[PDB]
Amino acid sequence: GAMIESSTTIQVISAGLPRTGTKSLKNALEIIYHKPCYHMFEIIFNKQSDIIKWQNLIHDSHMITTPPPLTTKTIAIYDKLKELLDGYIATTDLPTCGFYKDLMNIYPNAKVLLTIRDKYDWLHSLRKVVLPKSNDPWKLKIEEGDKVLGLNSDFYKLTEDSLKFAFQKDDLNFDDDQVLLECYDEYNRLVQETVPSDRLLVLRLGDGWEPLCKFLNVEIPNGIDYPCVNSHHQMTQLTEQLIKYKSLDAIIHMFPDLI
Ligand SMILES: Nc1ncnc2c1ncn2[C@@H]1O[C@H](COP(=O)(O)O)[C@@H](OP(=O)(O)O)[C@H]1O
Numbered sequence: 001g002a003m004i005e006s007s008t009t010i011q012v013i014s015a016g017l018p019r020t021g022t023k024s025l026k027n028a029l030e031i032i033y034h035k036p037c038y039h040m041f042e043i044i045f046n047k048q049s050d051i052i053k054w055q056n057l058i059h060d061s062h063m064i065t066t067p068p069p070l071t072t073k074t075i076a077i078y079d080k081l082k083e084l085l086d087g088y089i090a091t092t093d094l095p096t097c098g099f100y101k102d103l104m105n106i107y108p109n110a111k112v113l114l115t116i117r118d119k120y121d122w123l124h125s126l127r128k129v130v131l132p133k134s135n136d137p138w139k140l141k142i143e144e145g146d147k148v149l150g151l152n153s154d155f156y157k158l159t160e161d162s163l164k165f166a167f168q169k170d171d172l173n174f175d176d177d178q179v180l181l182e183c184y185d186e187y188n189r190l191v192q193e194t195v196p197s198d199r200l201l202v203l204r205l206g207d208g209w210e211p212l213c214k215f216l217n218v219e220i221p222n223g224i225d226y227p228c229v230n231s232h233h234q235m236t237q238l239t240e241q242l243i244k245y246k247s248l249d250a251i252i253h254m255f256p257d258l259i
């Protein structure tokens with residue numbers, strides 16, 4: 001196809017939860033659009049200064065009134081969210097995914113994605129990487145690797161609070177598998193009931209380029225396979241190598257495309 005000059009604004013809002021292929025999707029959107037896509041890894045590796053900004057936004061989010069019409073308080077919150085996303089062409093992952101409805105209002109010309117997978121595979125992946133049970137010995141290893149990356153209690157608070165915001169819960173028993181599974185199913189159901197279907201594409205892991213590129217009116221990138229990164233096995237290796245070498249820069253060359 002012809003090359004056209006794309007606007008550097010949010011063009012794709014992905015509502016999928018962590019551990020549903022968000023990093024591969026992030027990489028895929030950056031291959032298509034040649035501009036950055038938001039993701040929790042953007043915060044971890046490029047923009048830890050954003051942690052407090054996302055925390056402030058979640059803290060004030062209860063004041064949003066779903067538009068239309070637009071209230072004064074909502075505009076103030078939307079302005080901060082637009083500021084956080086300046087320079088990006090898409091959003092994925094926590095902490096953005098719980099804001100998908102508000103992002104749809106801020107960027108009316110953006111298309112919406114929902115990545116989904118088997119709920120038990122999701123939970124298993126979540127427990128290995130993002131939300132290990134309190135008494136899981138592996139939690140201590142993740143925390144040791146987190147410290148190497150400069151991630152402290154404020155990051156943990158953002159993870160918890162942005163998950164609670166996505167699930168619309170005032171509090172959450174993070175150690176209760178049944179609660180998480182029910183929140184997952186309810187979240188994915190609500191996305192599909194909220195987003196007009198002409199504006200939504202549901203992607204399952206393994207769908208690859210074709211449905212995505214058709215939805216976005218772009219050509220399939222020539223000779224580039226659809227990304228497959230961020231398996232829990234690979235994250236486990238990253239945690240162990242962070243613990244072994246005690247720096248990211250000692251090992252980053254060992255983790256292409258993930259970092
Ligand atoms: N192209 C692809 N095909 C199949 N699974 C994929 C994939 N890209 C990512 N995944 C899976 O999506 C999960 C990562 O999602 P996220 O990037 O949102 O954290 C991992 O699951 P597992 O941990 O079960 O391996 C990863 O293996």
Ligand SMILES: O=[N+]([O-])c1cc(N[C@@H]2CCN(Cc3c[nH]c4ccccc34)C2)ccc1CO
Nearest residue numbers: 018040041093094129130131142143146156159
């Ligand atoms: O938030 N996400 O969705 C998320 C978190 C992380 N990385 C972090 C690794 C360490 N954190 C796990 C953890 C260890 N102790 C805790 C105590 C309380 C709460 C959590 C923890 C999460 C990586 C990716 C993602 C999405 O891409």
